[PDB]
């Protein structure tokens, strides 16, 4: 958020969970940030080119991190037949 005349205030716009869209706090030490390598046309992983997911400590502690990562990965197309919407 910002004041009356442009000029963004609120230092540290925080990250949000890729699964539950909740704010990942500064002291949330059970939260992770997965980086998956991109692959180009030969089977080789390009260094420095990742697709990135952030998972909150709540979902990791509840044990939905694996299923949530399955869904996010299949949505981004790097999984094929792992996750089903109709459970």
């Amino acid at each position: 958020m910002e004041n009356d005349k442009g000029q963004l205030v609120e230092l540290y716009v925080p990250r949000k969970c890729s699964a539950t869209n909740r704010i990942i706090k500064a002291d949330d030490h059970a939260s992770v940030q997965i980086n998956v390598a991109k692959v180009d046309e030969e089977g080789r992983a390009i260094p420095g080119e990742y697709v990135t997911y952030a998972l909150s400590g709540y979902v990791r502690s509840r044990g939905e991190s694996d299923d949530s990562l399955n869904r996010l990965a299949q949505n981004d197309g790097l999984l094929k037949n792992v996750w089903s919407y109709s459970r």
Binding site: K16, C17, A19, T20, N21, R22, Y58, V59, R62, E64
Partner: protein, 129 residues
């Protein structure tokens, strides 16, 4: 027995959002529930919802984005006047810049900013932020 279907629906939405699910099933789906969900959807707190027709009373599946902190009912439905509106918003909204007290007025169910714009008041239904 079941005395407030709106209270049951908003409680089920709250528990779904706390648990982190992206959908919730609601029984038994009244008109007041539909209007309340429409106000929340208009302000962008839920997303799309779908009404399932049995021939009894209906069910609703609501999609949930992560934006909801709390939706509640105010029971009993207190009679509320024009200055009492700002008194209620001060009591149960987190800030002056967001959040809505939803109230049933004679010109339909609406949030308190629309009620101020239309200059109408009424009975209090609940809240959302």
């Amino acid at each position: 027995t079941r005395s407030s279907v709106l209270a049951d629906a908003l409680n089920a939405i709250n528990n779904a959002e706390k648990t982190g699910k992206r959908q919730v099933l609601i029984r038994p789906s009244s008109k007041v529930i539909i209007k309340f969900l429409q106000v929340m959807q208009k302000h962008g707190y839920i997303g799309e919802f779908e009404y399932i027709d049995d021939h009894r009373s209906g069910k609703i599946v609501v999609q949930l984005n992560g934006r909801l902190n709390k939706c509640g009912v105010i029971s009993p439905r207190f009679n509320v006047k024009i200055g009492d509106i700002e008194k209620w918003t001060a009591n149960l909204l987190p800030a002056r810049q967001f959040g809505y007290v939803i109230l049933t007025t004679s010109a339909g169910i609406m949030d308190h900013e629309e009620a101020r714009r239309k200059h109408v008041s009424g009975k209090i239904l609940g809240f959302v932020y």
